[PDB]
Amino acid sequence: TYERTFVKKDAETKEVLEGAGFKISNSDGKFLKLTDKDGQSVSIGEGFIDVLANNYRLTWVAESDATVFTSDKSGKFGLNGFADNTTTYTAVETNVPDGYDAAANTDFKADNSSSDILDAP
Ligand SMILES: [Yb+3]
Ligand SMILES: [Yb+3]
Ligand SMILES: [Yb+3]
Ligand SMILES: [Yb+3]
């Protein structure tokens, strides 16, 4: 399996940003949802989510039911536990902190890498 990590930052100052929320979309216009091993919804918090340690499952669902991932105190968020490292996904900023405009969508692959996402004030 594979992971991906993002760091949310202010475009001008490069300071990290807490509280920016994202959904993740695939080519079929479906969005990522985390469940426990019994298929139940799980309450997740800010930051990187260790899917493996917690024995969660990744599923693809409609936008309204998707899991929202949120940058933490150090701007980090993301997860591990992807099956495929060759599929294009897109991080979509659904929850924008006051003071900022949404970042443009970010295409990515689960390639165990980490990249910045920038929000203009
Ligand atoms: Yb907490
Ligand atoms: Yb603006
Ligand atoms: Yb794109
Ligand atoms: Yb950076």
Author numbering: 177 to 297
What does the paper say about this structure?
As the first reported host of “non-pathogenic-derived” pili, Lactobacillus rhamnosus GG is a gut-adapted commensal lactic acid bacterium (LAB) and one of many clinically investigated probiotic strains for human use in the prevention and treatment of certain gastric ailments.
This produced a 15 kDa-sized fragment that can be crystallized in two different forms. Intriguingly, six metal ions are associated with the C-domain when the structure was solved using orthorhombic crystals. Metal ions are primarily coordinated by aspartates, but glutamate, lysine, and water from asymmetric and symmetric molecules also seem to participate.
